[PDB]
């Protein structure tokens, strides 16, 4: 009897005749409310014993009092937003200064030197992104800053964009305002500021590819595509997006952007090779999807259009090297086996990050059903043995199955 | 009829408008100069208004997630003050009699 | 294609479709009979970010029918009055 | 766990009263469904 | 303490009456003890101020439940009655 | 008649092979040539490719 | 009201809520109650000193 | 993080009393000690007689900050939170007011003078332009019979009147506001209305007295 | 016209009306007025003793009568049960 403390929070044996306590299922310990009780605090609304008074004054203060604004004040709040042009100018100036003051990395002999972290650059680039509607990858920015030639390209393009915006204004803002006014009541060519912007975004994407973040490279190219209204710039951006999607194993988007760059051929300047690169990307996406005859047809059409550009020739030689062996093994690639084998390390990393593991993140731990997690039993897409749906019965309506022993 | 139920509901709530806050209430210095008939007339006016306001408050309490706080809540306080002033005047006259 | 319907069977047998459907469910769901209920299926008030939960809204068919309860289980006084 | 089961890692003994209390509790749950009572867990705190 | 701290569904009204109830009732009716008590006839007649005011200036809070008659043509509305 | 055990008596279990094989050990794995996911030889995926040609 | 006044800039002269400092205990005291008059209390406050 | 916690937990471990509770949660009971201390530390104006008397700080007075941050800085009283004993001085204690983002409005940040403590501020004599001790005095107006309270500086003897407070920006609806010319209608005849009341009271009293005589 | 005071740093446009800035009114000297009295001057007096403790709520009319003391108490109790100014309740235990 009573081989420990007397409080209910103690850890030893007690007895009712000497230390009678009321039924306390689960309550927080001596240090703090654990997660096992915060679960009840968030689901049931109070701790599972009912003896604790719910005191949520702090979260009330944090949410409701803060988000409360009188209507008479919110009517005028929107009338004092900062000027977008001045905000863009200030953000561009600050970002340019922060990029220019970035130190040059010293090249050591015998080992790779650690690049200086972009500590004072995440906030200016954040303001730049939130003012221009385009997100920049920090890994790509770090790689561009590490690369000496890419850093010079980025600095020159950012300076040109600054000067153009400060001397003429923001052409994307003008376009959006004119479109909104026309909707309330055509399309000009790509301006100099838009050209500088898409150029610096292409530099950022090239640095991001040199780093090895193909998803972020493709995202930067995608949000840069929204600023080009010229056929040459659009074809170049489509070829770049096709290459980035090929690297990121986005075969569908790669093929789409490649055929878009190919379709932009008649209205492009003859010197540009963006259409050839688009044909290359299209054929490469086909070959990755294992459509070898389709890739051969695409590369043949590309060669006939451009008589033998080096990229098209190398891709055709690779396709011919694959064709000199595919009939020697299987005469073709089976239909039920296409786009089944992994070829790139990007999808390997993606599978490592978001695959099904032994025990968790599989179809036996928890299932998702309309943004809600369910146990393995309550799986509406499966009626395997062990599911609750095998115990429904006839529901007193009609004999649905001819089964005699169960259901 | 439906006209007898339409006075239980606020017209501005039905028309999705902002219900303005009234001027003031019936003060004792003004209610002292009223006869008993006018006093009970304005008392029934206040009674109907208080019924409507309580119906509005109950509706907002039932739908507090969808609908926010009830607009212009000082009307309930004004009605209560007016009714209390009427009761004060009636009690004074009753004590004199 | 002509599967069994409770309403159709009740219309064929003249057995008060509501009462016929109540014949195939626990008595405490349709009558005022002693039966235990799960605390989860009972309604709960509204929270910040979620609407209110009502038992009548979440189980409309599992509601007690006072008419059927009185006409089947409760005794009428018109047959008992003897003046 | 093959080496562990070979070298007897863990309690060589096991619970003996469960294979009967399980069916007892299942019969009791049948009786509870008969009496129109909600089914409760056999071991809420002895776990 | 005699104060009932339970605010649930089985809240019980206390049948036991205390001295303070009578004291407050007298003070509210005829200003005890600053005013002399009215005679028994006036106290037990309809002309006593509480009954007179309850008859001529009624205080009943009958409010309509909008969830019954709002955007639905119904034959049986619902009211909240004292 | 048991008494409290010192920290050195507790760590003696780590010296044995039954403790290391249960807790301190890694897995031999490779990337599934079809799913590009980490995978141990002998166990496969729920997939019409990984069920016919199970890598 | 704190939030609304912070956002608007207006002034507040009376408390937005009635505070019952007795927590409902004054309703237990009879209505005709009043404190007695105490003579010759033990306090230096009635002197009106302003320098000690 | 609730869904992440419940995912990292195991399906075998069950937790009971998810929708109900063994103990009745409608018995009123006190909070924890630290929670009561949080309440007492936050809401200090709930204490009886917390408001400073007499009140001397009204919007429009020039005052200097005598202690704390921004010491020695002058300003003009903008607002007065009288029940909290707080003052909002102009361009003093300016802090950013974060406004959360709604559906159609982004998150905005605005500056506003926050309430300052009354004890750490002192008035400025308008004739001397220096800190002065001000006390409340009572003076009768030469043209108005009322006796109003002014604020006299003990140093120079300068009277500072109290400004009125009234805002007519909000108006009532004409559909439920009776006009003044109809509200101030004197329609009460005391002699005629008191007579019937007295008659009814007397009749009731006489009836009961006759019944008492009957039983006696 | 904006009904509230503009925030620190805002510049009101032309035509927009703003509530007036607070300022002191007229100012006179003490020797010009003849009848000057200090507020609550008598400290040694004994008539200023409270008839009710300092923590009691004020349930009375402005003139001092107690005709509606019970009505005021009932109104205060009803307001404590459910105030009219009560905004959106954050607790997980709401009446509806
Ligand atoms: Mg119970
Ligand atoms: Zn696989």
JSON list of C-alpha atoms in Angstrom, two decimals, chain E residues 21-54:
[
{"chain": "E", "resi": 21, "resn": "UNK", "atom": "CA", "xyz": [-35.61, 36.80, -1.09]},
{"chain": "E", "resi": 22, "resn": "UNK", "atom": "CA", "xyz": [-38.35, 38.28, 1.08]},
{"chain": "E", "resi": 23, "resn": "UNK", "atom": "CA", "xyz": [-36.18, 41.31, 1.88]},
{"chain": "E", "resi": 24, "resn": "UNK", "atom": "CA", "xyz": [-35.46, 42.06, -1.79]},
{"chain": "E", "resi": 25, "resn": "UNK", "atom": "CA", "xyz": [-39.11, 41.46, -2.71]},
{"chain": "E", "resi": 26, "resn": "UNK", "atom": "CA", "xyz": [-40.33, 43.96, -0.10]},
{"chain": "E", "resi": 27, "resn": "UNK", "atom": "CA", "xyz": [-37.69, 46.52, -1.09]},
{"chain": "E", "resi": 28, "resn": "UNK", "atom": "CA", "xyz": [-38.62, 46.17, -4.76]},
{"chain": "E", "resi": 29, "resn": "UNK", "atom": "CA", "xyz": [-42.38, 46.32, -4.15]},
{"chain": "E", "resi": 30, "resn": "UNK", "atom": "CA", "xyz": [-42.79, 49.17, -1.67]},
{"chain": "E", "resi": 31, "resn": "UNK", "atom": "CA", "xyz": [-39.31, 50.53, -0.96]},
{"chain": "E", "resi": 32, "resn": "UNK", "atom": "CA", "xyz": [-38.74, 48.75, 2.33]},
{"chain": "E", "resi": 33, "resn": "UNK", "atom": "CA", "xyz": [-37.85, 50.12, 4.77]},
{"chain": "E", "resi": 34, "resn": "UNK", "atom": "CA", "xyz": [-37.81, 53.75, 3.61]},
{"chain": "E", "resi": 35, "resn": "UNK", "atom": "CA", "xyz": [-41.50, 53.75, 2.66]},
{"chain": "E", "resi": 36, "resn": "UNK", "atom": "CA", "xyz": [-44.51, 52.67, 4.74]},
{"chain": "E", "resi": 37, "resn": "UNK", "atom": "CA", "xyz": [-46.17, 49.46, 3.54]},
{"chain": "E", "resi": 38, "resn": "UNK", "atom": "CA", "xyz": [-49.41, 49.85, 1.56]},
{"chain": "E", "resi": 39, "resn": "UNK", "atom": "CA", "xyz": [-52.59, 48.48, 3.14]},
{"chain": "E", "resi": 40, "resn": "UNK", "atom": "CA", "xyz": [-53.54, 44.85, 2.67]},
{"chain": "E", "resi": 41, "resn": "UNK", "atom": "CA", "xyz": [-56.29, 45.73, 0.22]},
{"chain": "E", "resi": 42, "resn": "UNK", "atom": "CA", "xyz": [-53.95, 47.50, -2.17]},
{"chain": "E", "resi": 43, "resn": "UNK", "atom": "CA", "xyz": [-51.32, 44.79, -1.67]},
{"chain": "E", "resi": 44, "resn": "UNK", "atom": "CA", "xyz": [-53.80, 42.01, -2.57]},
{"chain": "E", "resi": 45, "resn": "UNK", "atom": "CA", "xyz": [-55.69, 43.92, -5.28]},
{"chain": "E", "resi": 46, "resn": "UNK", "atom": "CA", "xyz": [-55.00, 44.24, -9.00]},
{"chain": "E", "resi": 47, "resn": "UNK", "atom": "CA", "xyz": [-53.98, 47.88, -8.45]},
{"chain": "E", "resi": 48, "resn": "UNK", "atom": "CA", "xyz": [-50.75, 46.95, -6.66]},
{"chain": "E", "resi": 49, "resn": "UNK", "atom": "CA", "xyz": [-47.94, 48.30, -8.82]},
{"chain": "E", "resi": 50, "resn": "UNK", "atom": "CA", "xyz": [-46.38, 44.93, -9.85]},
{"chain": "E", "resi": 51, "resn": "UNK", "atom": "CA", "xyz": [-49.68, 43.49, -11.10]},
{"chain": "E", "resi": 52, "resn": "UNK", "atom": "CA", "xyz": [-50.82, 46.82, -12.56]},
{"chain": "E", "resi": 53, "resn": "UNK", "atom": "CA", "xyz": [-47.60, 47.16, -14.55]},
{"chain": "E", "resi": 54, "resn": "UNK", "atom": "CA", "xyz": [-47.63, 43.50, -15.59]}
]
